[PDB]
Amino acid sequence: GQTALHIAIERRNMTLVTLLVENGADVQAAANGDFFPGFYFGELPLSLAACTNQLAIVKFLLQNSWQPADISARDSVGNTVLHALVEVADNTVDNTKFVTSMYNEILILGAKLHPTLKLEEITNRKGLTPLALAASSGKIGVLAYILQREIHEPECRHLSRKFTEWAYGPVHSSLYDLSCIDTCEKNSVLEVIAYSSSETPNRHDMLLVEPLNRLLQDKWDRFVKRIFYFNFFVYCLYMIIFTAAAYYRPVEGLPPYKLKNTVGDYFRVTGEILSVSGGVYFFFRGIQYFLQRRPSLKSLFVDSYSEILFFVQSLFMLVSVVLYFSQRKEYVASMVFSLAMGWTNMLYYTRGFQQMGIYAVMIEKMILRDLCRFMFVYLVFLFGFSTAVVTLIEDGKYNSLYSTCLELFKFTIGMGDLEFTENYDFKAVFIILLLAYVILTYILLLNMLIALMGETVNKIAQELQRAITILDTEKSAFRSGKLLQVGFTPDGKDDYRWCFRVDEVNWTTW
Amino acid sequence: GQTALHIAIERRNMTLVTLLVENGADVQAAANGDFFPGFYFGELPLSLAACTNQLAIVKFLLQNSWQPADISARDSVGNTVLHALVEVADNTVDNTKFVTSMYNEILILGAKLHPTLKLEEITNRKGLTPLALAASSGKIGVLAYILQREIHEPECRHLSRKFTEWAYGPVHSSLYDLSCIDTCEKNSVLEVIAYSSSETPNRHDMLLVEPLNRLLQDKWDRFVKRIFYFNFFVYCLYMIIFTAAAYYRPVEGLPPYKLKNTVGDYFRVTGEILSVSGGVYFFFRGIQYFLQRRPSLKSLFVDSYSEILFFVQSLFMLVSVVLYFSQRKEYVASMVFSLAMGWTNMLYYTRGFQQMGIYAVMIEKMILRDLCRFMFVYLVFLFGFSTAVVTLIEDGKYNSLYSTCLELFKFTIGMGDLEFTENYDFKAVFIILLLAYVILTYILLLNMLIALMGETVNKIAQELQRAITILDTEKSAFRSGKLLQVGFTPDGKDDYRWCFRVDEVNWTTW
Amino acid sequence: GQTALHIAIERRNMTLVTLLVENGADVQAAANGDFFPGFYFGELPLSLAACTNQLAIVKFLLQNSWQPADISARDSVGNTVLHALVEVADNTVDNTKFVTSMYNEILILGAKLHPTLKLEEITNRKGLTPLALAASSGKIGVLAYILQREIHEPECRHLSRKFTEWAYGPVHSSLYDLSCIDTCEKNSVLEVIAYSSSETPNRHDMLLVEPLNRLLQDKWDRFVKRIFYFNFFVYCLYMIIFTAAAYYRPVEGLPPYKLKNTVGDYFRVTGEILSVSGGVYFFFRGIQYFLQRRPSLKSLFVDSYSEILFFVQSLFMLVSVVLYFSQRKEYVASMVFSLAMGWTNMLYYTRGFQQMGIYAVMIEKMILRDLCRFMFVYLVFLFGFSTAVVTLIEDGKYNSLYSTCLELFKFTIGMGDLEFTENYDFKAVFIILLLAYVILTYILLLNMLIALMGETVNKIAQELQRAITILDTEKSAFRSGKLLQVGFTPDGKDDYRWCFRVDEVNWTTW
Amino acid sequence: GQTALHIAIERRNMTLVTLLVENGADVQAAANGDFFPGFYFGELPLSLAACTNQLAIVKFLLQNSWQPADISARDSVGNTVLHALVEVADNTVDNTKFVTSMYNEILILGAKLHPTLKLEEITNRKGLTPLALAASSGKIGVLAYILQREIHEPECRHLSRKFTEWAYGPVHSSLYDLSCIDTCEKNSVLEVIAYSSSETPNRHDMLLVEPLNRLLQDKWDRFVKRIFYFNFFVYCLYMIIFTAAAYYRPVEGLPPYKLKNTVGDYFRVTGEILSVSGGVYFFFRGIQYFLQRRPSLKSLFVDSYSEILFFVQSLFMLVSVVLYFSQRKEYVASMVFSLAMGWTNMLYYTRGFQQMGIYAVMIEKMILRDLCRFMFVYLVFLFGFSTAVVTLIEDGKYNSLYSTCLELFKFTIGMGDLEFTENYDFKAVFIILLLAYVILTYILLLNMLIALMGETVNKIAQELQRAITILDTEKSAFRSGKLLQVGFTPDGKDDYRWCFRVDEVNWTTW
Ligand code: NA
């Protein structure tokens, strides 16, 4: 699908390009090769020039007597030259510098040639703006350049995003464009950075850009602290009510239980109803959370490992209700399961409280990454050695697998047991096997712990929990801007862009 | 409240300032704006010039035909130009360099114009000298510059603080001004650095400046070692006497106890009186310590966590006396409480003894920061799981909460208990709950310990206990200087400033 | 054995060398001194010049009217000038640079003078090419230079190994010579790097050179994943069959056991036959592995510590069979030993699964390096203290060594025992000895663990498991190349060298 | 005591010094001031000039028409100019460079003016050569310069210490002067570095200088390996004999024991005699070791902590003999004590065996530095809490201190005990006290371990055991040189200086 102009752009023989354009060959068309091993640039000469160190060629292409190159052209994916430039970024110092410079130059040139049109709002077929993709794909450099972009040339000042409302000696106040940042209402940058599954390279590094962290802190201190505390208090109240109702369970038999006229019975019924309603609410919240987020199965356990616990607790409560209305005695078992699991899940609110711990990330390094491994290996060892031992046994209580495993389990943990290291032949063989099993398992545990410590030392000497907490609570006085005035457009109309006031104290470069 | 001269100082159009002053507009007045978002400089043109890179403007302002600018002017807060310069410091290399240079230049110029006056002793309304505020607010750079300041120009040599009594080849001896350092008797710098609540940025970094550490070591080796050892010995004697008196408590009944003529009874009465007197003394010492220090409630536990223990021990002893003189049998309980707590508090003297341990700071990282967290979480888990278990129980001894919690406590710690994992339905449910509880609690403990180790490795690869011990013991042969002679004043009078002899061995720059 | 030309080469008096050669003295001969304290260079003037900063002298020697120096001469060891240059490399930046430059220059010059001959294929008496020795002896720099060598001069382009099939803007594809790399079929470089005993300096650092890692990954993802999973599955199946057969062992007496017509008996016989066949297969695989590798006795335990376990398991199974066919009752003991050991050896497949753990190298730092040390020291302590204690004992059950050691063992581990700290004189002496023993042993354990952690922190902050797994499984759709065309030889014949396509995305130096 | 010439040397007015010397004032005399706050230079103008950046003045002083300055003058301490220069060194890069240059210049000048005299052998009143003091006082730079000193000027080449017997291309062999290094027979440098108490700054850093480490390794591989192994074997034999003799102790009563004619009795008597002789030998070796070393009391435990153990073991054996020949039954107790302690002391030979452990220095960081601290604190806690508890007790078995402490000891370690948490009032008080005691003690232990790990990580990331082992075994085929020839003296006599051949492979600077 390649055409001569594409090769000339690649060869950069600007004489040949000028000769091809002098006849007026073409300036758009498109490449559609399977290769286009491969390399993607937007299947256009405009994008090809913009992406491969061509300022002269792109300047010549965008406007010319024979056939001006439309800058608003949308490709099969809708990849505009700006969106293609975003797609090509690779997060390198030289590459980042060059791509930011190219973005600036192309934007200013397009504005100067066509001031009425605004290329920033252009979106692809998927329905994403170039900044939205820069955030989704993890392009830190392009995002950093855009979020604090500024233009110092008349007739295109409107394209800038950061300004300086007033400067005073050392202190000077700067304004930031929050449009498409806090509430884009469609694919807000914060939302995309937060939602996006955990494989993007620099999800954490992209929430430290200047406006974002301050915006999150402002939202927090505005309302989210109160929302979080209210949720914590109401959850504690619900758990206390559930515990009180479950403690006073009647022992007559085979529910349902008939209401007896008394204050205690009325209170018990009220508490039962409230607990069931709360469990039902949790079930619905979890199911619709899953519906609207649609996370990857791989991310269910690595991420969002608390919502699953809440959902299964709700499942336990619902199963308890079902068994309660079926004349069964296992409703109590299900109820106690749910109660204990809720008391455990109360830990979710440990966050939002600095005092409770700053480095609570080892929970994820350990409750799965090492606990599950150790349990698996230990169970395999248990089964194998128990089978060997029971095979060695002649008769008695321990010629069965379960009895032998239950006691080989006891020896290991120091509970010990009644010494059945006796009453059979091959005494030395049995003692040797027992020693081997106990040693090996404790060796394995010792390794898990050594690995934990060795990882934590540099995980803590090499390097956002609230960045997610704030958004989730927000999505359980929510503007974060005031519609300032930053001049006018190419036309003479007041421009309003939800500026976020920020003031920094500086004491040099006066 | 801003006036044209203020703007001109900000704009730095020294032509415009010269024109404004040529008419003789004004050179003092004051700014009083709510803003004066904000920025503080001393609400004067003199301070404004001194604080914002103006040497020419300040030189022109301080003296001029039309209206010389009084350098001794005191503002609403009493902020002199020097005190304002101290207030503006932000602890940056360039900012520190500039502010120190400005301080030097302004001091020398003011001395030259008005040699009789001494601006250093000037104090604000609060009653603090500029050095005192530099120490209180945590301005390390300004303090470091001032403490070892020196002037190499005749007619202003008196303003210097560091000198060179005699230089000998490699070795040369320098003298340091200790006025307002060791015993200012009002707001001594050491005292301010020590008292100041724990939020100042660099309280530790400000006790390493050259004179201070040597001064503290000299005071220590002079007297404080002996004072500390004497206190330790007398406390041990008192504790031994108290233990001996408490051991021989009579068992007759319902004090007070009538004196029986015998040597043992006389000794017992003497010991009881001495112990009560000591407890009373501790109570008074603690109460008046609290009165004269008035620490923040937030700093009671983080800092001064031993004085609180001593005070509560004294409270226990006093309550014991009160119950003793009321015909009650709980005086023994209170007495044993106080005795045990004093034996524990004996640890306070572990400091002052290098040999006992250099890195004993983990006490603070752990006895509160992790012990309290773990206890809280473990108690919550205990309550929830015990309620669940007792709800599951049908009848018997363990259908009560306390009996179940007392045994669920025993399983966890390896004491175990008589196996009540029996004699009821839902056996598997109970065993599952028990396993969950035990596991979870030990998982939590394992995390606390991992966090401890991971924090300690770099707390000990990244970075004063005696700096506080020495001052406190001093405040339970206390001069640290000898009134040397360092020349004369602008007048012809001998100058005495409590020089502290210091000699350093150097082998370069000859 | 040294001759004047050798000294002149050492002295570098190129005038004297030219005068010696003008008469036509000689250009080959050989040195044979015991010294040739010592220094090896290939016992030739050609090699001596090439190895000691002589380009002019080597250029003059290789060709001259009087006596051209044959470059293909082979010495007593067969050390060609190229092979000698490889032997002299010492892995230093300057030395590496110089030796690579000398190799390049000598190769190109030899090709230009004698294009028909190919010096690369030349091999020593041992039967190794220069690259093979560079890999065997651990010469990283020479290997790195050779593996990605390239020549930019006509008439010798064939000597190059790396090419550029097509370059496209940023992306450009390069081809690598895999001849003598993947399957040399004689002494392949990968094979030599892997086999070579563990004393070579940089066995790990030599498997990161550009082509090698990508080649290993390609082989893995091609077939080795499937081979490994198939082996794991079949081993699990065999172990399950063995366990099932061993569980149902009859209890009649004194094998062999007569076949009773029933489905269960048929299945039991089938399982027994399969298990014996598997053990026999493992025995043969291990013995022939040892035969064909012939590792050092020192490397048996440090390396290949799993094959030994498999072999001894097979030995246990064979001994079980032998005792089974001899009317003995210890076949069961041998069978259970083999069963347990196989269940343990199942851990070998933990590798090949990232998820199970990345840092599983501490196994080697600990299962031997610390476990064996601790066991040895603890057993010595046990023997000494038990002898002392039994000597102290007067009469009773514990006047024998075994009874005392069995109980001194119990005290230490917290099992405790029936308190025999009673019923004899010198009570305090016994208690003191017991305390000493217990303390000392736990002190020793505490040290082993401290050393483990202190080593692991920097072993994990300072710095291939699959590099060996892949080769071993390969040697349990195996080409890794496609016979590309890279031009022609000095003659006009198509050249085929098993190119490995590789494409790298680069965004600079255009 | 200062004289005008001293001041002029200090002022460096070489015109004034020339004028003072023109009259011929004096060139020796001496300073004797109490100051000579202070600064020591050798109380001479020659030493003063040499020590304070004076080459011109020292050159003028050493020789002049009026009064040549004797360079061999010895002061009150005998401080020659060279010895004074050694004394003044402070181990700084600039100071080290300058002092080495001054030493070189003064030595060469003194040799040229007076070639017959040799200033190196000059010794102070204490009887030490300048190199000996450089080693004793910890002057690393001066020692490093001297040990590999070289002079490239005829008529003074003899003063050099390092030479080059033969250079061959890359490899070149250098010879080192071992006189006064290996066996000075008086105050050998190695001996001084080893003996010297543990306060010298860089005892370790001074055993890495080029000749010393190679010399130690050569001595080791020559004989010390065999000596060490022989000692280990003979000690093991003696311990086995002692254990066998002690096992068969007769039980008749009240030694001495009459000899009964039998092989067993003869063997028993032989073993007893051998054991007593060995203990006696150890006692004598230890006492005379202490006599000839005379270490500081502070260094007895920090250093040489194994010789003390051996000596006390010998004391136990001797006391056993004494009680044996006095008709007492405690000879057995003493014998078992000595036997157990010897079995423990066997650990001393763990060194000399790399395999047993490289980082076995934590023994010293822990067996004293933390074990003793923890034991002390724990015993204090034990006493205090036990006194409190026994005071609380009313009657029964535990109204005595020992019974209560013995059980409060048991609770802590998990042995537990028969639950006496019962049968008295103030139940809650007792339980609270018990919890407090147990917690506090385990908290303290946890801290000791945390400190251990935190210290070991950087003690092992920041930085000789055999350096001491080798010397001690040597001092339980001992030349290490061969009397090479290195030219002649200023006279025409062959010079012999025990050269140590050393050859280094170098591949640059040809
Ligand atoms: Na136990």
Numbering used by the authors:
A (entry chain B), B (entry chain A), C (entry chain C), D (entry chain D): 201 to 236, 243 to 603, 627 to 692, 699 to 711, 719 to 752
Pull text from the paper:
We therefore obtained cryo-EM data for samples in which diC8-PIP2 was provided to the empty-pocket TRPV1 preparation. In the dilated state, diC8-PIP2 sits higher up in the vanilloid pocket such that the inositol headgroup sits above Y511, which is reorientated toward the pocket. Moreover, Y671 adopts an α-helical conformation and M682 and is oriented toward the pore axis. These features are hallmarks of a channel in which the resident PI lipid has been displaced (that is, the pocket is empty or occupied by a vanilloid agonist). However, there are some differences between the diC8-PIP2 dilated state and a typical vanilloid agonist-bound structure. At the same time, pivoting of the S6 helix makes the new restriction site formed by M682 narrower. In this case, one ligand can bind to the same pocket but with its inositol headgroup located in two distinct positions associated with closed or dilated pore states.
Identification of a pocket within the TRPV1 transmembrane core has provided initial clues as to how phosphoinositide lipids bind to and regulate the channel. Here we show that this regulatory pocket in rat TRPV1 can accommodate diverse lipid species, including the inflammatory lipid lysophosphatidic acid, whose actions are determined by their specific modes of binding. We captured several states of TRPV1 ranging from channels in which the VBP is empty to those bearing different bioactive lipids, including distinct phosphoinositide species, brominated phosphoinositide analogs and a pro-algesic lipid, lysophosphatidic acid (LPA). Together, our data show how the VBP accommodates a range of bioactive lipids and how occupancy of the site corresponds to the structural status of the pore.
